[PDB]
Design an enzyme around this catalytic site. Structure first.
Site, PDB file in Angstrom:
ATOM      1  N   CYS B  85       0.840  -1.179   0.000  1.00 14.14           N
ATOM      2  CA  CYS B  85       0.000   0.000   0.000  1.00 14.14           C
ATOM      3  C   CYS B  85       0.881   1.237   0.000  1.00 14.14           C
ATOM      4  O   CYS B  85       1.209   1.788   1.050  1.00 14.14           O
ATOM      5  CB  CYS B  85      -0.933   0.016   1.200  1.00 14.14           C
ATOM      6  SG  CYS B  85      -1.815   1.578   1.330  1.00 14.14           S
ATOM      7  N   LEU B  86       1.280   1.650  -1.193  1.00 12.97           N
ATOM      8  CA  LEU B  86       2.098   2.842  -1.379  1.00 12.97           C
ATOM      9  C   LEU B  86       1.207   3.994  -1.840  1.00 12.97           C
ATOM     10  O   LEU B  86       0.637   3.943  -2.936  1.00 12.97           O
ATOM     11  CB  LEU B  86       3.215   2.564  -2.393  1.00 12.97           C
ATOM     12  CG  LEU B  86       4.256   3.664  -2.616  1.00 12.97           C
ATOM     13  CD1 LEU B  86       5.202   3.818  -1.442  1.00 12.97           C
ATOM     14  CD2 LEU B  86       5.033   3.410  -3.890  1.00 12.97           C
TER      15      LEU B  86
END
EC number: 2.3.2.23
Lengths: 76, 151, 373
Positions: B85-86
């Site tokens: 989850c960037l």
């Protein structure tokens, strides 16, 4: 190896497989993991519809490859 | 290819110097898949390296890329299926003007020091928030055993 | 002259246009799609306006009992199933149909879209509802309304944000490498479309940016389904003239194909979240007084205004999905009050400017949600 057969219902089915396995074998692993009878299955890879009797390597399916599973219309 | 933006981006990643990201080979039929190595500097990952895949959607740069970790890792924001989850490439902050070298840079930034107020792995999140050091030793034998070299 | 009336009108058009006698639809549950497609395709559009006798063989004389408005539910569930590759879901997490460009992998796909067109028109014509319906852009096409960049937000939110980013920012010093062409993956295979002549070699800049934004917007709506769409509209128009639809908007047509859904006003209140409002700000108090007071059709329309659809997921409001993942019904407080309320269907969010009187909130909300052209 390991492949992902992706549906349009957004289920990603992972399959355990060898490059030796035939398209019929992989359909069989689908029937077993999803219940879907092979005679009504369609596998596609990188825009090629996978003919039964060939093998994953004829189609050059390496590992992590995504197949696509589509059903045949009941009528035909 | 087509993919004339992807070329400029590959060019200006290879020549941008990239200390923390290397060995970037690519699917050259359409530059829609990249593989590279992340080489963290700060602990608890400085004793490791990590194969990633970057997958560009056909309509790039209208939709963001997807990064997955091929190497396993011990990080509160990377699940065990390798999804990270960037935020800069989330479906809610993606801009067209965002280049892949900025993506990586923010991935590194995320490796060097995580953010556990929003985590993919809650354990971990709290094991970072509380007990900053019980985290690191575990991160280290994970990177020791599972991560790669040089770095 | 609102929805009640449009409905009477449409129903009267149908009544007043029905041929006599009946038409026999013989199917069995086990072979529902093949039998249906066989039965319906063998008949003339006109016949599909005669009275409908559906038989389920094997259930035959006891029941019914019944009956087949069941056929409409059951069949709708079969032919609209993305597995068959004719229609597909709009997004990962929102579940209203659109045409799948991959449909061509079906041996005679234009025939099946004509079938489905007939089928749905039959549904409207006989006043029977079907299980899940189409996207709002889809409905707009049926009404021949123009699709616009804001229509994108519901069906491809990232492509939308990207598009709008380009409209609202100067790009000259931005090194975007954008050209008038665009690529699309179907079934694993990537293909290239020029947006104008030799478009792949034309560079997007500040001066062509608007033209570009235009063409992308069409293309995204239109891409790879021109022929299936026409097959559908034709099949539909033979059964129920599209021009009978001209007083309806896309939201009303949703509600005519789905039923009136059940909204549990409790379930709604429990699961609403508030940004810069609270459960006690009396704009919200006023809000919920309006939700309890009015029609069930107002509630659906309101549910359409804020979520882009009148239907609810399996379960209720506790599991409302947005674009990026789950998102509950949300009311946020926005500025001035010389505005009307606005929405963000991908975020499921109502922007409610603080109004000054319960009546003011009631008349403005009701004007925003009934006036969606």
């Amino acid at each position: 190896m390991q492949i992902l057969v992706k549906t349009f219902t957004w289920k990603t089915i992972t399959l355990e497989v060898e490059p030796s396995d035939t398209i019929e074998n992989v359909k069989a692993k689908i029937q077993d993991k999803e219940g879907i009878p092979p005679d009504q299955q369609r596998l596609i890879f990188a825009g090629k519809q996978l003919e039964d009797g060939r093998t994953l390597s004829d189609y050059n399916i390496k590992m992590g490859s995504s197949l696509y599973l589509v059903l045949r219309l009941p009528g035909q | 290819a087509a993919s004339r933006r992807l070329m400029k981006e590959l060019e200006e990643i290879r020549k941008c110097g990239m200390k923390n990201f290397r060995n970037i080979q690519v699917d050259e039929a359409n530059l829609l898949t990249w593989q590279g190595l992340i080489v963290p500097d700060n602990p608890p990952y400085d004793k490791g390296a990590f194969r990633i895949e970057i997958n560009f959607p056909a309509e790039y740069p209208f939709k963001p890329p997807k990064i997955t970790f091929k190497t396993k890792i011990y990080h509160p924001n990377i699940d065990e299926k390798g999804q990270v989850c960037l935020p800069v490439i989330s479906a809610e902050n993606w801009k067209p003007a965002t280049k892949t070298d900025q993506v990586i840079q923010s991935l590194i930034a995320l490796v060097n020091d995580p953010q556990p107020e929003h985590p993919l792995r809650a354990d971990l999140a709290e094991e970072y928030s509380k007990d900053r050091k019980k985290f690191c030793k575990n991160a280290e034998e994970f990177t020791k055993k599972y991560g790669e070299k040089r770095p | 002259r609102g929805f009640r009336w449009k409905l009477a009108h449409f129903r009267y058009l149908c009544q007043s246009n029905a041929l006599p006698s009946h038409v026999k639809i013989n199917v069995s549950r086990q072979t529902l799609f093949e039998d249906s497609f066989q039965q319906i395709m063998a008949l003339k559009p006109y016949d599909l306006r005669r009275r409908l006798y559906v038989i389920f063989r094997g259930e035959e004389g006891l029941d019914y009992g019944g009956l087949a408005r069941e056929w409409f539910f059951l069949l709708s569930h079969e032919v609209l199933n993305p597995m068959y590759c004719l229609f597909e879901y709009a997004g990962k997490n929102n579940y209203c149909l659109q045409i799948n460009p991959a449909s061509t992998i079906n041996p005679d796909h234009l025939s099946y879209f004509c079938f489905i067109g007939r089928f749905i028109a039959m549904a409207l014509f006989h006043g029977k509802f079907i299980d899940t319906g189409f996207s709002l852009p889809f409905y707009k096409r049926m009404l021949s309304k123009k699709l616009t960049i804001k229509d994108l937000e519901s069906i491809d939110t990232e492509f939308y944000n990207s598009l709008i980013w380009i409209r609202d920012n100067n790009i000259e010093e931005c090194g975007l490498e954008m050209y008038f062409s665009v690529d699309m993956e179907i079934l694993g295979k990537v293909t290239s479309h020029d947006l104008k002549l030799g478009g792949s070699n034309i560079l997007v800049t500040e001066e062509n940016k608007d033209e570009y934004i235009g063409l992308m917007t069409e293309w995204r709506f239109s891409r790879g389904v021109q022929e299936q769409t026409k097959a559908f509209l034709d099949g539909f128009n033979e059964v129920v003239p599209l021009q009978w639809l001209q007083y309806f908007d896309e939201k009303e047509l949703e509600v005519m194909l789905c039923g009136m859904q059940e909204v549990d006003l409790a379930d709604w209140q429990r699961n609403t979240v508030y940004r810069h409002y609270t459960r006690n700000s009396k704009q919200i108090i006023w809000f919920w007084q309006f939700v309890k007071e009015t029609d069930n059709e107002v509630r659906m329309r309101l549910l359409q205004f804020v979520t882009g659809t009148c239907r609810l997921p399996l379960g209720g409001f506790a599991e409302l999905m947005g674009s990026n993942g789950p998102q509950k019904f949300c009311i946020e407080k926005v500025g001035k009050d010389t505005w009307l309320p606005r929405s963000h269907t991908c975020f499921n969010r109502l922007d409610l400017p603080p109004y000054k009187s319960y009546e003011q909130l009631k008349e403005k909300l009701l004007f925003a949600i009934e006036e969606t052209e």
